[PDB]
């Protein structure tokens, strides 16, 4: 609840201050790209990162299209899998939070295919 509230407070300050654009849009998306692109973080930081990606818009979300495949291949361990035993295969997370991640990674991906 706090991640979903603070993510919708970041979008409030990207519109309250549009005169500071190109001075807190690339800074915040660089913070999110820096915090997101690793393996050794806890699940909630990844959830906050993806919701902060969701409260951005446009090509910046497309800017995270390329580096999502290797992110999934490192954080979800599909080492040669054939998508069949996915319910009881995986290693860091539990099943519920992996389902939350696969839900939220397309909750923001719908913005790039609706235009």
């Amino acid at each position: 609840a706090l991640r979903d509230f603070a993510a919708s407070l970041l979008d409030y300050v990207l519109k309250k201050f549009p005169q500071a654009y190109k001075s807190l849009k690339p800074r915040v998306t660089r913070t999110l790209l820096k915090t997101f692109l690793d393996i050794n973080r806890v699940f909630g930081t990844y959830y906050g990162c993806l919701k902060g990606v969701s409260v951005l818009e446009g090509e910046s979300i497309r800017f995270f299209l390329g580096n999502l495949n290797n992110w999934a291949r490192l954080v979800f361990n599909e080492s040669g899998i054939t998508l069949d035993n996915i319910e009881e295969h995986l290693t860091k997370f539990t099943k519920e939070e992996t389902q939350i991640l696969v839900d939220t990674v397309i909750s923001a991906l719908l913005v790039l295919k609706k235009d």
């Binding site: 690339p26 660089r30 790209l33 820096k34 692109l37 690793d38 390329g66 580096n67 992110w71 490192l74």
Partner: protein, 36 residues
């Protein structure tokens, strides 16, 4: 005495997890440079 340090270096780079973390970090630095 550098043999134990070389073995500690080999202990922290071997496996699948380190090279994939490097592949994430170089993708971060390439996209961060190419953000503008």
């Amino acid at each position: 005495l550098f043999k134990l340090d070389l073995e500690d270096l080999k202990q922290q780079i071997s496996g699948t997890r380190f090279i994939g973390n490097l592949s994430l970090k170089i993708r971060y630095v390439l996209w961060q440079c190419a953000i503008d």
